[PDB]
Paper text:
The glycoprotein complex (GPC) is expressed as a trimer on the viral surface and constitutes the sole target for NAbs. Each GPC protomer consists of two non-covalently bound subunits: the membrane-anchored GP2, which contains the fusion peptide, and GP1, which possesses receptor-binding sites for both alpha-dystroglycan and lysosome-associated membrane protein-1 (LAMP-1), the two receptors involved in viral entry and lysosomal escape, respectively. The development of a recombinant protein vaccine has been hampered by the instability of soluble Lassa virus glycoprotein complex (GPC) trimers, which disassemble into monomeric subunits after expression. Here, we use two-component protein nanoparticles consisting of trimeric and pentameric subunits to stabilize GPC in a trimeric conformation.
To assemble icosahedral I53-50NPs presenting twenty GPC trimers, SEC-purified GPC-I53-50A was mixed with I53-50B at an equimolar ratio of monomeric subunits and incubated overnight at 4°C. The assembled NPs were then separated from unassembled components by an additional SEC step. Therefore, we separately processed the signal originating from two flexibly linked entities, the GPC trimers and I53-50NP, resulting in 3D maps at 3.97 and 3.67 Å resolution, respectively. The I53-50NP structure is in excellent agreement with the Rosetta-designed model and the published structure obtained with I53-50NP presenting HIV-1 BG505 SOSIP trimers (PDB: 6P6F29). The RMSD values for Cα atoms were 0.74 Å for the comparison with the Rosetta model and 0.51 Å for the comparison with HIV-1 SOSIP-I53-50NPs. These findings confirm that GPC fusion did not interfere with the folding of the I53-50A component or the assembly of the NP.
Numbering used by the authors:
A (entry chain A), C (entry chain A), E (entry chain A): 1 to 206
B (entry chain B), D (entry chain B): 1 to 145
C-alpha cells in the first residue's frame, strides 16, 4: 500500500531535497528554508551526527505537508532507528535484501539504489518498481531513456548529476523525481529558499 | 418479442464495438420489451453477407444489422471488398425478405493517429443509435404495408 | 459527494471547453480535437439541436478521461434530459431553485450562474460553493478579486471574457477554472487542436 | 476432420506460395488434427470463382480459400478482373452455402523491383496466417448459429 | 555448435539492425528496406505487439540470406515463444541463468547483456564468449578497449551509442558487430534503405 501512496507523491511533487548539515540546528534551518521554498519531499541523510534528532524535530512540519525520510541508509540497524524516528521513506545507495524485508514488515517505503540492468532486474524480482540511481554523473539521462524499452514499468529517481541547468533534461528522459542536493541545499538559509523556488519553477515548466 | 441479429466484424473491434453498444442501448430506450438483440461475430466484413443470410433464413430474426469498419488499406486496395460486401447484403435482403440493414462504413481517409481512432469511436456510436431507430421504423413500416 | 469530486477535477484540469456546433458530426469532431489537445472538461451546450445525441456519442471518451457535461441548461425539463443522457455537470446562466433541487436528488453536480453579491449569497445559502460568472466581459477579474474578501470560500468559473491573452489574469484573481469557448472551440478541427494546446500550456505556466 | 480447399493462382507464384505455405502452417498450429488442407491450382485469378464453386458443390469441403496476386497491369487495366473475381466469389459463397474466403489482393502500386517482391512475400505470408484464423473462427461460428 | 556458426556470421556481416515498429506491416516494411539496403542480421524486438507474427512473416527472407532473431527478451516464456517462431538469436539486456539454460537445450544462440567486469566474468563462467553491451552511451568504446586486456577472448556487440559518425570508432576498439537501431531503422522505408547502405559502406571502410 505504501508504494502506491509514495508513487503518487513523487509524481505530484517532483523534487526531493537531499539534506546534509554539520549540526542539528543547521539541518533544521535548511529543511525549513527548502520547505518554505516549495520542496515538500525531504531526505535527512542518516549517516550524519544526530540524524534521529533531526528527523524527529522536523516531524512538526509533517502536518504542514512535509514528508521526511531517511537518506543513505546502508544497514538494518540504521533502518530500525530511522523507522522509530519517523522516516516515511528509507532509501539506500545499493540494493539490499535485509533492508527490503525489514521495510516491508514495518510498512514503510523502500527505494534501493541501482546502476546496471542486472541490478534493475534483481530489484524488480524483489518487488521494487521505483529505483534510485545513486551514481549520478557517471550514469546520465541516457541510461534512463535506454532502460525504458526493456523495463517500461521501472521509474527512476536519479541522485547527483542534477542541477538547475539539467532540470527537464532528466524529466524528458522519463524521470519520476529528482534527488537534488549540494545545489538546492548548500548555502545560506535565504539563498536556499530562493534556489528552492528556482528549482520548483524550472520543474513546473516540464 | 422480435429478434434482431447483429453481425460484427472483428477488425478494428474497438470501433465496431462502439457501434453495437450504442445500438443495443438505443434499442432498450426505443423498443424495450419489444425487441431483443442477438450478437454474432465473423472474422471480418467479407463474411458478413453469408453469415447474415444464414441467420435471415433461419426464421428467428425480424431484422439483421451488419456492422464493420473498412479502412483505406494502406498497401492494398479496399474498394473491391467494400463494394462486394454492400452488394452482397443487398442481394441477401432482396432474396430473403428480411430488412438487412448496414453500418458497414468506409471512411474517406482514416489515419491511425489517436485523433482518428477517437473520432471514429464517437461516430460509430452515433451510427449505432441511428440504426436502432431505423430497425424499429422499418419493421413497423413492413407491418403497415 | 459529487461536489467534492468536481472541485478536485476543476482544480486539476483548469480549462473547460464550452462547445457549440451546427450539427452532431461537427460537435463530435470538435470535442475530439479539444480532448486530443489536452482539455478534458467539456460542456455540450444543451440548447443546440441534438444535444442529447452528442452527449451520448461522446460517452465513448469517458473511459479515456473525458468529462462531458450539459452547458446552458435553463430548465428542469432540459436537466432531466441531460441527466438521462450522461451529463456529469449541469450548468446554467442563472441561479434556479428547481434545477438545484433536481440535481441534488439525482446526484449530479450543479453549478448555477451568478453576477452580483446578493446572488452569490443566495447561491451559498442553497449550498453552492462553486459558481459560474455568466456575463463575462461585463464582469471582469476585478469582481473575482473583490468578492474574495467577504466570500473566501466561493470559487469561480468565469465564462466569456477569457481568451488566450488574459489567461493567468483570471487565475491570478482567484479563479478555479475558465469557461473558454469561441476561441478554443471555433475553427477547423486541426486549428482547434492546436489552440487547445496553446491554452493548456499558457495555463500550466500559472 | 473438416477439409479446407485452397485454390491458387499461378501468376506471381512465389507470392501466392508465401501465402498458402503460411496458411497451412498456421492451420497446423491452430487446428491441427481437426482440419486438413487440399491445395488445387488454376491458371490465374479469373478462374478462381468457377473452380471454387465446383469444389464447394462437391460436398467435401467446409470452406474454400481462394488466393491470388493481381497487379496494376502495366499496359493493361486490371480493375475489371479484380472486381469480377471478388464479386464472383461472393456470388458463389451466397448461393452454395460455403464460407468461401479470399486472399485475392490487389496492391495500391506494385513495382517489379526486388524491394517489392520481398515485401509482398512477407505480407502474403501474413495474410496466410490471418486466413487460417478466419477459417477456424467462421467455421465455429457457423456451428453455434 | 550454434555459437560457432554465429560468431562467423557476425564477423562477416558486422551490422545488426535492431528493429521496432508500431504494427506488423510497419515492421515488415522496415525489415525489408533494411535487408535490401545490405543489412542481413535483424533482431525483432520481442516486447512489441505481434512480435511472433513479424518473426514468422519474415521467415520468407531466410532463404535470401536474412537472419531473424528475437530482440530484448527478458524471460523464459518469451524465449519459448521466440524459439517456436523462428528466432535464430535470442538476445537480452541482462544476463539470466534460466534463459541461458533454455537456449542451450533448444540449440539456439544466446547473447546476454553485460555492463561491468564482474558480469563479464559470470557470463564467461556460464559459457558466453559473445556479450552485448546494453547500456551503450553510458558505456562507450573505452570499455571495449579496456576489457580487451584481461578478457582477450570476449567479444562485444554494443547497442546504442552507435550512429553513423562513430562507425569505426567502435570497430577500432575491438567490436565484433554493432547493434544499430533508431538511426538505421527510423524513418520512411526509402530513407531506411538509403541509410542502411550508408552504414554498410562506412563499415566496409574498416
Amino acid at each position: 500500500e505504501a508504494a502506491r501512496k509514495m508513487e503518487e507523491l513523487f509524481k505530484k511533487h517532483k523534487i526531493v531535497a537531499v539534506l546534509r548539515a554539520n549540526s542539528v540546528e543547521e539541518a533544521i534551518e535548511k529543511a525549513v528554508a527548502v520547505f518554505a521554498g516549495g520542496v515538500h519531499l525531504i531526505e535527512i541523510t542518516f549517516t550524519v551526527p544526530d540524524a534521529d534528532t533531526v528527523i524527529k524535530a522536523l516531524s512538526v512540519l509533517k502536518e504542514k505537508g512535509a514528508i521526511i525520510g531517511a537518506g543513505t541508509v546502508t544497514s538494518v540497524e540504521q533502518c530500525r532507528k530511522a523507522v522509530e524516528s519517523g522516516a516515511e521513506f528509507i532509501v539506500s545507495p545499493h540494493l539490499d535484501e535485509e533492508i527490503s524485508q525489514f521495510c516491508k514488515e514495518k510498512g514503510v517505503f523502500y527505494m534501493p539504489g541501482v546502476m546496471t540492468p542486472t541490478e534493475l532486474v534483481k530489484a524488480m524480482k524483489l518487488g521494487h518498481d521505483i529505483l534510485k540511481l545513486f551514481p549520478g554523473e557517471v550514469v546520465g539521462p541516457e541510461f534512463v531513456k535506454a532502460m525504458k524499452g526493456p523495463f517500461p514499468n521501472v521509474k527512476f529517481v536519479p541522485t547527483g548529476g542534477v542541477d538547475l541547468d539539467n532540470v527537464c533534461e532528466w524529466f524528458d528522459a522519463g524521470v519520476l523525481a529528482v534527488g537534488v542536493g549540494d545545489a538546492l541545499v548548500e548555502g545560506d538559509p535565504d539563498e536556499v529558499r530562493e534556489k528552492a523556488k528556482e528549482f520548483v519553477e524550472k520543474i513546473r515548466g516540464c | 418479442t422480435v429478434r434482431i441479429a447483429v453481425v460484427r466484424a472483428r477488425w478494428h473491434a474497438e470501433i465496431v464495438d462502439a457501434c453495437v453498444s450504442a445500438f443495443e442501448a438505443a434499442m432498450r430506450d426505443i423498443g424495450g420489451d419489444r425487441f431483443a438483440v442477438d450478437v454474432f461475430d465473423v472474422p471480418g466484413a467479407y463474411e458478413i453477407p453469408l453469415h447474415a443470410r444464414t441467420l435471415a433464413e433461419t426464421g428467428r430474426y425480424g431484422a439483421v444489422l451488419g456492422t464493420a469498419f473498412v479502412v483505406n488499406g494502406g498497401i492494398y486496395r479496399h474498394e473491391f471488398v467494400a463494394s462486394a460486401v454492400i452488394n452482397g447484403m443487398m442481394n441477401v435482403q432482396l432474396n430473403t425478405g428480411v430488412p438487412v440493414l448496414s453500418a458497414v462504413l468506409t471512411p474517406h481517409n482514416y489515419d491511425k493517429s489517436k485523433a482518428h481512432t477517437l473520432l471514429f469511436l464517437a461516430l460509430f456510436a452515433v451510427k449505432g443509435m441511428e440504426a436502432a431507430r431505423a430497425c424499429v421504423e422499418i419493421l413497423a413500416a413492413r407491418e403497415k404495408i
